[PDB]
């Protein structure tokens, strides 16, 4: 309720990064260019993960990536 | 109970299907009368055109909706010359079969349910059984044959009027050029889709006629129960029509979408 950022910014079930054994990383981006949550993490252009949260900590955006 | 009801409806549909040759040979004049009654309506609804007028109005409305919303959205985006391409695939794939099915269900199926319920209450089915006549063969099989004969012209008119309404709305009210609309319509429309849609509509009409004849044939409770039978038959018909269209579209285009734009 208080942290409601939209239907586009809520974590969604399924897909890569949601299965057991997935690793959680934090990426301190200088800026996000209006990137939404549930976007695709790509290694070698292959969709292999998902960004969970894009909370902004102390004016620098931080991304939680599965 | 549940298995017993499924078995009763299965017995009814099997008995109705196996008596189609018997009805075709023995009862031809009755089949022609039912064809006329289904095509041109009955009662107070026959004076306005019957099933043809209702089907035409509903399909014109559906085509107008497609053209209206389609052109609005594409003009907002900017790529509005694709409307003729968007309308056709809207009509054939999803809109026209389902909409024609619901209108056919309402008119023809509710009329059949009401007629068979009135015959059941008025002891006319008992009169037929006393006179040594297969009631199912005389009534339900004749209805099925009449529906099979009448569905193809009805769906042809439905498709024609849906296409006409979409084209008229796009090229008259929205003032799009007729050449661009006709090009994008005739270029991205495949006759194979129309043939498969006709097959879907034929199967759906047979199922709808069977369901409504079942609900009207075993009616009970006097004149009051006929209306409840009509309502239940309508609910079942809606569900069956939507399910049939979904399954057919899933089977046909699951692997090959049958549509090419890019390289």
């Amino acid at each position: 309720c208080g942290q409601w950022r939209g239907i586009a910014n809520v974590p969604l079930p399924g897909g890569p990064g949601t299965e057991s054994g997935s690793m959680t990383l934090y990426v301190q981006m200088p800026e996000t260019l209006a990137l939404n949550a549930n976007s695709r993490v790509r290694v070698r252009d292959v969709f292999v993960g998902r960004v969970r949260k894009i909370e902004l900590i102390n004016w620098v955006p931080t991304l939680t990536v599965d | 109970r549940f298995l017993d009801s499924m078995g009763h409806v299965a017995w009814f549909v099997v008995q109705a299907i196996v008596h189609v040759p018997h009805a075709f040979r023995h009862y031809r004049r009755e089949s022609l009368r039912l064809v006329a009654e289904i095509g041109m309506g009955t009662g107070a609804m026959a004076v306005i055109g019957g099933t043809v007028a209702i089907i035409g109005f509903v399909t014109l409305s559906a085509g107008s909706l497609i053209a209206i919303q389609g052109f609005a959205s594409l003009g907002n985006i900017g790529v509005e010359a694709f409307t003729g391409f968007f309308a056709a695939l809207a009509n054939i794939r999803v809109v026209a079969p389902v909409v024609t099915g619901q209108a056919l269900a309402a008119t023809v199926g509710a009329g059949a349910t009401a007629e068979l319920g009135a015959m059941r209450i008025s002891e006319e089915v008992d009169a037929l059984e006393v006179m040594g006549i297969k009631s199912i063969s005389y009534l339900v099989s004749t209805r099925i044959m009449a529906g099979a004969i009448v569905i193809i012209p009805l769906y042809a008119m439905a498709i024609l009027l849906s296409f006409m309404s979409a084209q008229l709305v796009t090229t008259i009210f929205y003032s799009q050029s007729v050449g661009t609309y006709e090009h994008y319509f005739h270029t991205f429309l495949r006759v194979d889709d129309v043939m498969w849609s006709f097959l879907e509509v034929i199967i759906m009409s047979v199922i709808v006629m069977l369901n409504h004849c079942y609900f009207g044939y075993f009616a009970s409770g006097g004149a009051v129960g006929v209306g409840e039978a009509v309502g239940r038959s309508m609910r079942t018909s809606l569900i069956a029509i939507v399910l049939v269209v979904l399954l057919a579209s899933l089977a046909l285009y699951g692997t090959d979408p049958n549509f090419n734009l890019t390289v």
């Binding site: - | 009368r33 008025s122 002891e123 006319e124 008992d126 009169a127 059984e129 006393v130 006179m131 040594g132 006549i133």
Partner: protein, 298 residues
């Protein structure tokens, strides 16, 4: 006309039973009437005798074949002897009186159009509808519908005729007209007519045999003279329309000279056969009943 031998019949819709252990012997060619208080399931009995409904137990023998236990192929030939008049005629509104009448002749007989027209016009003349063959069932009154249904039932030369509440929707005068018509029909074609009704004028004027249903049982069945002199409280109360007797206010709380055929019609062989059977039965009746029946027969 042919005889119907009912034995141990019983109907039941679930837990509720309609009538239990009905035993009859409807004689050949004679008019018989089944009576009872309202809500005794007489129409269910009428339907059961032709096979529309299936009694749980019992037997309904016609000729020598129990029509209750026979294949539907044989049932469609058994029902050729029958002719049924329903409470409203059970006509089909799609076709006129002529086509409704000719329908049995077009389904079974391999006759021509001229022969069918002749017999249909004859049977429409028999029931007082000579020039009403072009009208539709929705354009005629209830009595005319009954006449048309009877005419349809007469085309195939029936042996047994069933009548479901001939008094429904008819005042006593038109009911008297229809009763005279039934007597005339039995005089002419000599068909086993069976009627279900609770009317008392019909019960005391028309039939040769009468039976009584009360409290889901058969009280008694027998000839006209046996029941009209009966000292059974239920039969006497019902036939006299009294208010004092076993019959209550609702279902929960539970000799007349007879009608003669129109002059010019052939003699009713049913009357003589009924009189002979009454003479045979006479020695098993109370002395007052025997004396009354002897006075009637003399």
């Amino acid at each position: 006309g042919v005889q119907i031998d009912v034995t141990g019949l019983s109907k039941s819709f679930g837990s509720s039973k309609i009538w239990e252990d009905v035993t009859m012997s409807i004689p050949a060619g004679e008019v018989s009437v089944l009576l009872g208080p309202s809500g005794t399931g007489k129409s269910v009995f009428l339907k059961s005798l032709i096979g529309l409904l299936r009694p749980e137990r019992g037997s309904i023998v016609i000729d020598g074949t129990d029509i209750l236990q026979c294949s539907a192929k044989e049932l469609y030939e058994i029902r050729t002897l029958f002719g049924v008049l329903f409470q409203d005629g059970a006509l089909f509104g799609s076709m006129n009186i002529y086509d409704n009448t000719a329908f049995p002749l077009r389904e079974h007989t391999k006759k021509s159009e001229s022969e069918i027209r002749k017999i249909v016009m004859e049977k429409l003349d028999l029931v007082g509808m000579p020039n009403d063959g072009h009208k539709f069932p929705g354009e005629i009154s209830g009595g005319m519908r009954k006449r048309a249904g009877l005419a349809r039932a007469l085309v195939l030369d029936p042996e047994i005729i069933l009548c479901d509440e001939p008094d429904s929707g008819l005042d006593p005068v038109r009911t008297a007209y229809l009763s005279q018509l039934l007597i005339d029909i039995n005089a002419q074609i000599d068909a086993t007519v069976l009627i279900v009704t609770h009317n008392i004028n019909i019960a005391r004027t028309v039939p040769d045999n009468m039976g009584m249903l009360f409290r889901k049982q058969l009280v008694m069945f027998g000839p006209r003279e046996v029941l009209l002199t009966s000292e059974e409280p239920v039969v006497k109360q019902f036939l006299n329309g009294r208010r004092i007797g076993p019959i209550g206010m609702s279902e929960e709380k539970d000799v007349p000279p007879q009608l003669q055929a129109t002059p010019g019609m052939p003699e009713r062989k049913a009357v003589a056969r009924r009189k002979a059977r009454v003479r045979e039965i006479l020695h098993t009746l109370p002395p007052a009943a025997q004396a009354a029946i002897l006075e009637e027969l003399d």
